[PDB]
């Protein structure tokens, strides 16, 4: 897609292996927020949003949390609380044309900044401060979307970069995406480490009478510490006790 009307995909219910990405390194730039690209390979996620578009190679700077500028302001904002990763690479080899590749478009201006993660497909003339022109171009009355017109005789910063931004969430839902790590038997008594769908901790695991309702992936103490989990393979509610611990 154009970064105007950028595409979105609900990547889910599958096994990822981001090592194939992080280690491929063919793309020029790769950045992450809220995770390292290495540790990323060993987590599970409730959902993943993959969005992709094309922008000028300098504009990649704006595709980050809290940036400002026409791309972030009018094409793809990112929330300050964002988590995910941005990747981009020079794609001049595929996206330029001898005469400008006017297929791609970007909204040059808008009545206000976009929502931090919203999409805007409208194409009304951006009204002037003058009386409305009702679809007539004129004084400040402009068609809202400009074309980059990518062509090869163009500076690297201005060369087209196609971009994929992955974003994901960590809700109360079960994970639907996880890394390639294997899984063990459950040593259901000894003090052990555990990693249930990425929930990382240590304790004595045990059976429980907690009688979770079917939607309940976790249970918590009055302290709001985690206290039980359903074993995602057994679907059985196991209680978690902290290991033997005290002053000597």
């Amino acid at each position, epitope marked *: 897609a154009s970064v105007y009307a950028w595409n979105r995909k609900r990547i889910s219910n599958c096994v990822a292996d981001y090592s194939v990405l992080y280690n491929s390194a063919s793309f020029s730039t790769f950045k992450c927020y809220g995770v390292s690209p290495t540790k990323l390979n060993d987590l599970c996620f409730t959902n993943v949003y993959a969005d992709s578009f094309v922008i000028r190679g300098d504009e990649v700077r704006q595709i980050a949390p809290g940036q400002t500028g026409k791309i972030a302001d009018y094409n793809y904002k990112l929330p300050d609380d964002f988590t995910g990763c941005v990747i981009a690479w020079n794609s*001049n*080899n*595929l*996206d*330029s*044309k*001898v*005469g*400008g*590749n006017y*297929n791609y478009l970007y909204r040059l201006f808008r009545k206000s900044n976009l929502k931090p993660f919203e999409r805007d497909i409208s194409t009304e003339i951006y009204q002037a401060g003058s009386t409305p022109c009702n679809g007539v171009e004129g004084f400040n009355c402009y068609f809202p979307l400009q074309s980059y017109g990518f*062509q*090869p*005789t*163009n*500076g*690297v910063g201005y060369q087209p970069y196609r971009v994929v931004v992955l974003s994901f969430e960590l809700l109360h839902a079960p994970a639907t995406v996880c890394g390639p790590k294997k899984s063990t038997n459950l040593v259901k008594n000894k003090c052990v480490n555990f990693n249930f769908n990425g929930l990382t901790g240590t304790g004595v695991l045990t059976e429980s009478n907690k009688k979770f309702l079917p939607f309940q992936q976790f249970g918590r103490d009055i302290a709001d510490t985690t206290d039980a989990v359903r074993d995602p393979q057994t679907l059985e509610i196991l209680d978690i006790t902290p290991c033997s611990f005290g002053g000597v």
Partner: antibody
Amino acid sequence: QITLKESGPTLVKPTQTLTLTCTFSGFSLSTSGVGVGWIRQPPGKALEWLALIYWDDDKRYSPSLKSRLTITKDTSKNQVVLTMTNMDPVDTATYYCAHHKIERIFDYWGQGTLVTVSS
Amino acid sequence: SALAQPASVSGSPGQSITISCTGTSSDVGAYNYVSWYQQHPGKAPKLMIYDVSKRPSGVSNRFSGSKSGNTASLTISGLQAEDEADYYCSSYTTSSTVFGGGTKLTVL
């Protein structure tokens, strides 16, 4: 293998419009980022790019001759049909159709066809 | 043409040879994708350098190249009589794709 092949009448009177069909194989012109263009070479002078068509039905022509050049294709026949009106005798030259990518500005070239403008 | 070349250059076997190419700043910019084509008389040019020093599959390993600013340069290591052919630099311009004036190599 990937190849291109020029075809059409090599002799055209100047009043008529030359039509040339380049036939290709080993790829589909619908492939993203692929294009096919034309190059001609009169005897002993440098080469001149004429026209280029991209997979996405997008057309380009040399502005010095864009008025006269008209290019067309039929992906179902794996053919690019070029046409240019009002042949000047000076247009008599060898003509080439070639496979194009941005990275490989003209990777593979057809055999080329002679073109002559006279009686 | 917006791209110019020496009409001819001379070398001898086992020596290096260079054919320069000159762009036109007003429509070459980064002067990227500057290719070089060999053309023996009566044959279709064959791409041999696409990006500077970058060689397409079926590379004749002796062929090589370089660039310096607005000046491109083809380099052939260990000349041989088979090199004697036309050489054309070519690069994109925002108005159009263009070819250099060619160079008539002589391989003494």
